[PDB]
Amino acid sequence: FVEMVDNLRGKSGQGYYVEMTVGSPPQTLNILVDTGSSNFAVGAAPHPFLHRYYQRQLSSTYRDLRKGVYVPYTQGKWEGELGTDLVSIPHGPNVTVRANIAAITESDKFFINGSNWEGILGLAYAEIARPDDSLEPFFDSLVKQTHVPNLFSLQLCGASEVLASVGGSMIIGGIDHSLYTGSLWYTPIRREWYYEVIIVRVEINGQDLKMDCKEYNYDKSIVDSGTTNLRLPKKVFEAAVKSIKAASSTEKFPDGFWLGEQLVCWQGTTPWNIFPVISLYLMGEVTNQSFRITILPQQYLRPCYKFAISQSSTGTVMGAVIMEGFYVVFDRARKRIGFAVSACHVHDEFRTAAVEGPFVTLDMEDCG
Numbered sequence: 001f002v003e004m005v006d007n008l009r010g011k012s013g014q015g016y017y018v019e020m021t022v023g024s025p026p027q028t029l030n031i032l033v034d035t036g037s038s039n040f041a042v043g044a045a046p047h048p049f050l051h052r053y054y055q056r057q058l059s060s061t062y063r064d065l066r067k068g069v070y071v072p073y074t075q076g077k078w079e080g081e082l083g084t085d086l087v088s089i090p091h092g093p094n095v096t097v098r099a100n101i102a103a104i105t106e107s108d109k110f111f112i113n114g115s116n117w118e119g120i121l122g123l124a125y126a127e128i129a130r131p132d133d134s135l136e137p138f139f140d141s142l143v144k145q146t147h148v149p150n151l152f153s154l155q156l157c158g159a160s161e162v163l164a165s166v167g168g169s170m171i172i173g174g175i176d177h178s179l180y181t182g183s184l185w186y187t188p189i190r191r192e193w194y195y196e197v198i199i200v201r202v203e204i205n206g207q208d209l210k211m212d213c214k215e216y217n218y219d220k221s222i223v224d225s226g227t228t229n230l231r232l233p234k235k236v237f238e239a240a241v242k243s244i245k246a247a248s249s250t251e252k253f254p255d256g257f258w259l260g261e262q263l264v265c266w267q268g269t270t271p272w273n274i275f276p277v278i279s280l281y282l283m284g285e286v287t288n289q290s291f292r293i294t295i296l297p298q299q300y301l302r303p304c305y306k307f308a309i310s311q312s313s314t315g316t317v318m319g320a321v322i323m324e325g326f327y328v329v330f331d332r333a334r335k336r337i338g339f340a341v342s343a344c345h346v347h348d349e350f351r352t353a354a355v356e357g358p359f360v361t362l363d364m365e366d367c368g
């Protein structure tokens with residue numbers, strides 16, 4: 001796993017990517033590591049934001065699947081041609097796998113200017129793969145074609161003209177103990193489509209939001225490296241901001257700030273201590289057992305800073321601001337996701353991101 005440490009990079013807010021190669025000879029590309037989707041999709045045609053793309057004609061091992069894929073979503077869309085080719089991760093397991101590849105031929109609002117990645121590596125399950133679940137996801141092909149164990153770890157570390165550079169590690173097939181400190185707590189993967197989990201309770205600076213369990217997962221809750229913010233269902237979001245505004249209160253802020261769209265600055269003078277910590281209690285492996293994940297303002301305020309907690313209409317999304325500061329294990333083989341305090345992770349001399357348990361919680365089976 002030493003070879004996989006720091007194999008991730010990105011620009012704050014533009015996602016983390018790992019270097020991959022596709023085709024023969026090897027075509028080097030930077031791929032967004034996304035646990036919130038299940039397709040291995042790469043630009044395969046010129047685009048204003050792409051400085052390089054996958055060229056099937058140059059790959060002697062490319063095999064067309066004669067089959068298209070169309071993916072529209074609210075902001076725009078991407079469209080591609082299904083194919084198969086040899087795929088490797090230079091700073092990952094020393095193996096090469098034949099995987100499905102969605103060659104993006106046209107798109108709008110898919111790629112991001114300056115993000116430095118040319119495709120996406122959807123690490124979620126087949127159920128949500130496009131165009132349907134018969135298109136085996138990359139990780140599935142990896143495990144089926146190799147000896148690599150059905151599990152991967154993600155240590156997202158976070159972080160002037162330039163958006164800040166972020167780094168992290170994607171350990172495939174295992175758990176690197178030097179990457180975390182303390183104990184690893186696991187929450188069950190409720191269902192194998194998105195990496196769905198169940199939040200049983202949340203508190204702002206030790207104070208319980210006292211909401212019905214179901215509201216925390218209203219619709220669903222997922223662990224998604226492909227999302228920057230901690231996104232909360234409306235009701236939970238409103239309750240969370242009110243509580244945070246209170247905690248901060250000694251400074252007031254433009255609510256354009258609270259809405260994530262606008263920024264805020266001081267100049268190492270930041271009054272972190274004024275902002276409360278956020279604890280998300282996740283269902284434990286044992287019925288009435290749960291554990292908490294606690295994040296600092298250093299995590300939900302991303303650098304000037306922008307409030308990185310936003311409203312969701314699609315359930316809770318534990319994105320980067322949540323994952324950063326924790327070592328997250330996607331234990332697919334045991335249908336669970338483990339959290340441990342990250343070897344990296346920003347923290348002052350008064351508080352620290354934490355992973356603690358157990359905490360017992362009555363019902364919770366019914367938080368789903």
Ligand SMILES: CCCOc1ccc(-c2csc(-c3ccccc3Cl)c2CC(=O)NC(=N)N)cc1
Pocket residue numbers: 013014015016032034035036037038039041071073078110111120122128130224225226227228
């Ligand atoms: C931190 C920046 C992340 O940048 C992104 C770039 C593209 C997409 C995206 C466009 S269409 C699409 C997509 C939508 C449905 C199925 C397949 C794909 Cl590739 C995705 C993946 C996605 O939605 N991931 C996610 N929510 N975690 C998402 C984030």
